[PDB]
Amino acid sequence: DWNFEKMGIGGLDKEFSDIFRRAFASRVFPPEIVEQMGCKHVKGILLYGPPGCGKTLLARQIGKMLNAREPKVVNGPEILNKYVGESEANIRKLFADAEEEQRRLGANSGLHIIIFDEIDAICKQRGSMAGSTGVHDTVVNQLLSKIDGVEQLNNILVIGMTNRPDLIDEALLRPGRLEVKMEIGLPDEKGRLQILHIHTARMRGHQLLSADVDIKELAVETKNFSGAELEGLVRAAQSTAMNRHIKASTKVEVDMEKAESLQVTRGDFLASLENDIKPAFGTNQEDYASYIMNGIIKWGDPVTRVLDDGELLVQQTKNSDRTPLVSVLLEGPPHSGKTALAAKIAEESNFPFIKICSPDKMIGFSETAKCQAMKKIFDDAYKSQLSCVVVDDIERLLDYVPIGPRFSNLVLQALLVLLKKAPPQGR
Amino acid sequence: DWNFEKMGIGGLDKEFSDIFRRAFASRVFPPEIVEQMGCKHVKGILLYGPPGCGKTLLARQIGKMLNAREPKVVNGPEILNKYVGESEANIRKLFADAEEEQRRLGANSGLHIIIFDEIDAICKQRGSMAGSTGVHDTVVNQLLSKIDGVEQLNNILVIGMTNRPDLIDEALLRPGRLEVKMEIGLPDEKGRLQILHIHTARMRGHQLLSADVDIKELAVETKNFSGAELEGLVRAAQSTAMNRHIKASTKVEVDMEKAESLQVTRGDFLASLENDIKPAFGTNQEDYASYIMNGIIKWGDPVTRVLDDGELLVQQTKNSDRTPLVSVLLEGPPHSGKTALAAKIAEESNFPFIKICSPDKMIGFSETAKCQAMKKIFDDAYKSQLSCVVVDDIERLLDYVPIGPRFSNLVLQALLVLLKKAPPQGRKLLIIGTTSRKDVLQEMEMLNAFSTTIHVPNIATGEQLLEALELLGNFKDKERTTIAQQVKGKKVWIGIKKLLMLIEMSLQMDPEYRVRKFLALLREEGASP
Amino acid sequence: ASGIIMDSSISKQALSEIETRHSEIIKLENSIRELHD
Ligand SMILES: Nc1ncnc2c1ncn2[C@@H]1O[C@H](COP(=O)(O)OP(=O)(O)OP(=O)(O)O)[C@@H](O)[C@H]1O
Ligand SMILES: Nc1ncnc2c1ncn2[C@@H]1O[C@H](COP(=O)(O)OP(=O)(O)OP(=O)(O)O)[C@@H](O)[C@H]1O
Ligand SMILES: Nc1ncnc2c1ncn2[C@@H]1O[C@H](COP(=O)(O)OP(=O)(O)OP(=O)(O)O)[C@@H](O)[C@H]1O
Ligand SMILES: Nc1ncnc2c1ncn2[C@@H]1O[C@H](COP(=O)(O)OP(=O)(O)OP(=O)(O)O)[C@@H](O)[C@H]1O
């Protein structure tokens, strides 16, 4: 009875197509032809990306699509133990049934599925010298030996999920081992439209949704939203609509008078969108009210010139193709209003992503913490089709003081390296 | 009924020849001669190398070519136990059959194979953790005193596989113990051809491979592929060929009318090469697409001179034999095109291994981590018959700042020592390096390590500027005739990258207010040659 | 995180229940032997 329309995944057509082609394509062809080729099956999948974009959902749907046995699940690091050689026993206990059935039945055995969750908490680079190490070495060696060893298993499939794909071991990612790697990222307009149509199919079935709402508008007014937020928006709207039908708030009961006329209108959607949900890869309108405390006043000629120059730079950084990265420095005497003008230039650009990296959130930090914070902000900025980052009070970041002079070299080098690093292609 | 062709291993003729000569040569000779000489038999084999090059396959096949018992397999740390004195019992249980059949049948018994998998997990160096971890100091002693002890055995054979051959104990490798040590490395062209023939024989027996797929092209076009990568390539091509018939739009349905004409075409192989498989000791077209972002345009004479000099250096390093290590330094003013030319020179050498060591990927590291990264890259570069490496923007790799001055000493010493370390005998290496401040490097006595220097100049004439504009093709017709009138009657000093930036900045004005702002920008920058 | 430890064990003779009492069936056999005689 399986059909893709009931899986409930939107915005991931290409990823699923590739996964199906590479992994399951040879398990559904006639067995004679597959026997006249002598090709073994693929033995793993790895899924990585930012948080909230649909990793665990895909694995669950894959698990409950096949006619296989009920998949095993490992919920984080739940194999570790404090005695000698007790982690490896738990690692070995997972592959017992596959071995037994392969020995008994032969080439007629069914599929067995194992699902590792947060795989970067167990498998880490083994090491080179006789230092550090720990239980990680033994656990990783046992896992590597079990997946692909001197006895051949042909009836397993292993799935892994992770947020930090740069820590996992290299010997565990070669063809033969987990060799299918996919990236799940933020969706585009069609993706948001599909998700919003998936998440409001029941309500429309029972005529519980008003006639005012138009989904093609919410698919435009929500930029850089992930699935987990396009769900929360609808949930908040529904909660507001339901709470509007409870006049016995101090008490607990129902009027049971207009409940027959319960309906979700556009006002609830707008209110919830404007109050409750706050995206994490988008613009938030609280910074601009904390950095522009008295608005811009046109006391003379220069203000217009500065704003015009900012407008020209903003226009350039959006249409050109030879220069995907631009920079500019606003400088002047003390007590002149540089931060306000920078914030006002940033606010009037309509870039989906805007952020400010100020030094008043880094009180007491050492060098490395500042480096990590800056690197994190830029890493986040590298995941949107447009961006704008503001770096204010450069001299406070470097910890400068004329006596000496004294300052931080590491932060300076990090900044000088980040100022001329182009983003991935197309951004 | 053993036949080599049946083994199915390609690219390892010499290693197997040596293994056969040393291990199984005194067991396949008439007993009288072997007894008159009075020689014992070898009691081990060790196999180490990078991941994916075919170790476990060799052990598995060695386990099936002997009319002997069934080999015993130990999967990693499968012997450790939590109680006191159980690991040693597990280790002693492996040799019981050998000891029992040696004590009864005398000198007529048969082999008892034993296979250790990932031996470096339970046999690390002794006295390394203040008496070891408590259970890694008795396991090693038990193994040492049971392989070769007071009681003599003559009917065993132990095979070990490992990835890190430096952590193993030293007393376990003497010629009375695991003795035959081999290395399994990357194959060359004639190894890739054999691997492809082995993995494609079955398809070409039932007419499932379309005449049009030529194996020589695949052998040539896959440089520094391991065996596993070649197998994965073939498998991906087969999967792509299969998937054309299946349909998953609404419900899975396998067409059964076209399934009788299945044939794997070369387009599948090309697509799989392009999109699916990425090697580990090779190169791709992404680094070059990331560094040479706007191609290269011939705006004058010097551009060809630089490339010709680079070609001469490449030819020398490839042919000569007295000097297996040559290096060169490209220097010039800022915003001049130094990394693009280095990448272009490197890419047109056709060396198998090409890397780019850059500071873009070491943001926030201390100096120890920088040393480790550099050392690891140069270690990887020593396992190929021809290597080229590029060091980019040195002054950012030392943390130089005019005040003080300040910089890192460990990284500088590592660099100064790593420009004079020749590779293992028979292999050749090339090192290129880019910098924008030659005098500072001179002050540190770093211009003796480099063997030659090249100069990357700026644009310094009106004709060259006009030719660059013509090549780019932005201002045309009347506009050009204006610039020619204004710029020829003077001198210029500007870089190519800054020229691109200036053109782009100028193109944002109104259609009738472009040339004037462009000239204003060109004049304001200032030459100061 | 220090870890990786060991332990020792002891035992106990729990089958204290006696069995000699029910094994002295010889006298019944003697009586039935007299009967057969
Ligand atoms: N592509 C999608 N289509 C429809 N709904 C989606 C999609 N992606 C996410 N959702 C909704 O958002 C929820 C996000 O939960 P999920 O377990 O998929 O998140 P995750 O990104 O894997 O988790 P984490 O970031 O904690 O690792 C899903 O349960 C589903 O409700
Ligand atoms: N035309 C204007 N330009 C700039 N700021 C203005 C203008 N009119 C009013 N202001 C207000 O003046 C104040 C300027 O203070 P601000 O923090 O921007 O100064 P600054 O240049 O960052 O100072 P500092 O030298 O201390 O770093 C803000 O409240 C801003 O709202
Ligand atoms: N010379 C070869 N001829 C044919 N196939 C080969 C060859 N070398 C490797 N392979 C393929 O490599 C796979 C076996 O790899 P193997 O188990 O030897 O890996 P390994 O590198 O020793 O292990 P690991 O790196 O995981 O420690 C099989 O696909 C085998 O076909
Ligand atoms: N003839 C050319 N020579 C060099 N670069 C060229 C040429 N024509 C176009 N370009 C482009 O100009 C840019 C050269 O800048 P490059 O990356 O070499 O900077 P750089 O000299 O290292 O600068 P920096 O001063 O920051 O170190 C690249 O985009 C290159 O593609």
Side-chain angles (χ1 to χ4, degrees), chain A residues 1-5 16-17 20-26 28-30 33-43 83-86 88 92 99 126-130 132-134 137-139 141-142 144-146 148-152 170-171 174-177 179 312-313 315-317 319-326 368 371 375 400 405-410 412-418 420-422, chain B residues 51-52 56 59-60 73 75-82 115 117-118 120-121 124 128-129 135-136 161 163-164 166-167 199 202-203 206 208 228-229 231-232 235-236 238-243 245-246 248-252 254-256 259-260 262 264 276-277 280 293-294 359-361 363-366 372 375 393 395-396 398-401 403 406-407 472-474 497 500-501 503-505 508-509 517:
Chain A
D1 68 352
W2 180 83
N3 49 341
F4 180 62
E5 275 60 355
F16 180 83
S17 290
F20 187 88
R21 168 166 75 74
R22 290 201 65 181
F24 297 108
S26 64
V28 71
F29 221 57
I33 293 286
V34 172
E35 166 61 322
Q36 289 183 347
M37 296 188 146
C39 70
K40 304 210 303 306
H41 302 308
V42 177
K43 257 178 192 170
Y83 288 113
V84 181
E86 269 294 354
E88 292 94 42
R92 294 199 309 269
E99 295 179 12
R126 276 178 298 185
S128 59
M129 314 214 207
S132 183
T133 74
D137 288 4
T138 47
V139 175
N141 285 327
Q142 178 69 108
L144 267 59
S145 297
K146 292 305 301 194
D148 179 299
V150 193
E151 172 181 15
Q152 288 173 287
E170 150 53 9
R174 71 180 185 78
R177 286 204 182 86
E179 82 186 63
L312 285 178
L313 275 168
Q315 184 184 331
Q316 159 175 351
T317 176
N319 292 124
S320 179
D321 207 358
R322 306 179 181 281
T323 76
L325 179 62
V326 187
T368 177
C371 292
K375 181 179 166 57
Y400 179 77
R406 311 189 185 187
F407 56 90
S408 288
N409 208 35
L410 198 53
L412 166 54
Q413 299 301 343
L415 179 52
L416 263 166
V417 164
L418 283 168
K420 61 171 73 65
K421 174 175 184 172
Chain B
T56 281
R60 180 192 306 156
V73 189
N75 283 330
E78 186 166 7
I79 66 193
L80 295 166
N81 191 333
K82 69 179 181 176
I115 306 184
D117 204 324
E118 300 281 347
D120 74 76
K124 295 172 193 170
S128 176
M129 296 303 305
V135 76
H136 303 64
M161 290 92 81
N163 263 328
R164 305 171 292 171
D166 287 313
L167 317 190
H199 278 136
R202 197 80 151 281
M203 291 203 326
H206 305 54
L208 292 181
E229 272 100 37
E231 189 203 31
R235 189 195 304 160
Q238 290 172 1
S239 274
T240 294
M242 286 201 232
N243 175 269
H245 303 47
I246 291 161
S249 63
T250 299
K251 293 190 71 171
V252 56
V254 185
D255 179 9
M256 210 80 73
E260 300 293 355
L262 182 65
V264 180
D276 303 358
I277 304 303
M293 181 175 308
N294 295 14
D360 276 10
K361 314 178 188 67
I363 292 169
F365 288 180
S366 51
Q372 294 301 337
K375 176 179 165 51
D393 213 40
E395 68 258 10
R396 282 292 93 69
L398 312 175
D399 299 332
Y400 179 80
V401 61
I403 289 166
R406 317 190 176 192
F407 55 95
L472 298 185
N474 281 255
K497 188 185 199 179
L500 299 183
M501 178 59 76
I503 291 173
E504 255 298 359
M505 260 165 68
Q508 296 299 341
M509 301 289 290
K517 191 181 182 187

Side-chain angles (χ1 to χ4, degrees), chain A residues 265-281:
Chain A
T265 55
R266 178 167 171 181
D268 307 7
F269 271 117
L270 292 190
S272 100
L273 183 153
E274 210 270 355
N275 289 15
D276 295 64
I277 293 294
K278 298 182 182 303
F281 283 75

Side-chain angles (χ1 to χ4, degrees), chain B residues 250-505:
Chain B
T250 299
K251 293 190 71 171
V252 56
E253 58 164 10
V254 185
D255 179 9
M256 210 80 73
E257 311 184 3
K258 180 201 281 172
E260 300 293 355
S261 304
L262 182 65
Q263 281 216 342
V264 180
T265 59
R266 85 188 307 267
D268 318 58
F269 275 102
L270 291 202
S272 65
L273 245 179
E274 297 284 324
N275 309 347
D276 303 358
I277 304 303
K278 303 288 176 54
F281 282 56
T283 179
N284 300 93
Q285 316 344 320
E286 280 61 12
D287 261 7
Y288 307 153
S290 178
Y291 288 108
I292 320 177
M293 181 175 308
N294 295 14
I296 283 171
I297 78 191
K298 306 290 192 302
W299 52 256
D301 169 23
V303 180
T304 74
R305 177 183 69 88
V306 181
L307 303 182
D308 287 10
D309 289 9
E311 188 192 27
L312 256 59
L313 267 285
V314 159
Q315 175 176 342
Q316 171 188 324
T317 178
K318 184 165 66 63
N319 278 341
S320 181
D321 42 9
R322 255 196 263 266
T323 71
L325 180 71
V326 317
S327 42
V328 48
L329 176 80
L330 274 97
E331 53 99 339
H335 297 290
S336 181
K338 299 179 241 66
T339 301
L341 279 171
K344 167 63 80 170
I345 286 173
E347 140 184 309
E348 288 185 339
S349 53
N350 289 324
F351 285 14
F353 180 94
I354 288 161
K355 202 72 174 62
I356 287 170
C357 174
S358 189
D360 276 10
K361 314 178 188 67
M362 316 166 189
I363 292 169
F365 288 180
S366 51
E367 54 202 7
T368 303
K370 289 184 170 175
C371 289
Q372 294 301 337
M374 276 168 63
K375 176 179 165 51
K376 165 160 164 58
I377 288 172
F378 269 100
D379 269 5
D380 281 5
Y382 285 144
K383 296 187 289 198
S384 297
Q385 297 289 129
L386 286 170
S387 305
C388 175
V389 182
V390 181
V391 191
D392 218 353
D393 213 40
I394 296 175
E395 68 258 10
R396 282 292 93 69
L397 196 52
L398 312 175
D399 299 332
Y400 179 80
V401 61
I403 289 166
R406 317 190 176 192
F407 55 95
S408 290
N409 213 30
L410 268 68
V411 182
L412 171 55
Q413 297 303 342
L415 251 173
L416 264 167
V417 163
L418 230 49
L419 299 171
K420 298 142 59 190
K421 179 176 179 180
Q425 205 275 358
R427 303 175 184 176
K428 304 171 185 296
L429 173 61
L430 174 67
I431 308 184
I432 305 172
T434 77
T435 186
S436 150
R437 299 185 59 86
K438 189 176 72 176
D439 57 67
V440 166
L441 256 47
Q442 185 177 10
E443 170 59 309
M444 297 170 199
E445 308 288 14
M446 211 166 148
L447 264 175
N448 288 7
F450 289 109
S451 301
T452 193
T453 303
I454 303 172
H455 194 61
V456 188
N458 261 112
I459 289 175
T461 48
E463 301 89 345
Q464 294 169 346
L465 194 160
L466 261 72
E467 184 60 18
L469 266 166
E470 207 281 351
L471 261 298
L472 298 185
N474 281 255
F475 297 109
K476 44 88 204 67
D477 302 1
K478 176 68 206 304
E479 292 171 345
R480 202 83 60 73
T481 68
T482 306
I483 300 165
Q485 182 73 101
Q486 210 79 331
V487 75
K488 179 67 225 67
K490 219 170 287 181
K491 46 70 159 183
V492 287
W493 186 260
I494 183 171
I496 190 70
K497 188 185 199 179
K498 198 71 175 174
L499 190 74
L500 299 183
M501 178 59 76
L502 260 46
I503 291 173
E504 255 298 359
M505 260 165 68

Side-chain angles (χ1 to χ4, degrees), chain A residues 223-273:
Chain A
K223 276 181 290 192
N224 284 15
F225 272 66
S226 38
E229 266 129 25
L230 281 157
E231 164 187 323
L233 171 60
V234 180
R235 191 159 60 202
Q238 293 178 356
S239 274
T240 290
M242 278 157 48
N243 161 89
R244 175 150 45 80
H245 268 259
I246 280 176
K247 310 303 195 315
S249 300
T250 307
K251 215 203 310 310
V252 160
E253 230 174 24
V254 69
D255 297 7
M256 183 57 285
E257 188 177 6
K258 306 307 301 185
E260 191 76 6
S261 59
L262 174 56
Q263 286 202 336
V264 183
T265 55
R266 178 167 171 181
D268 307 7
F269 271 117
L270 292 190
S272 100
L273 183 153

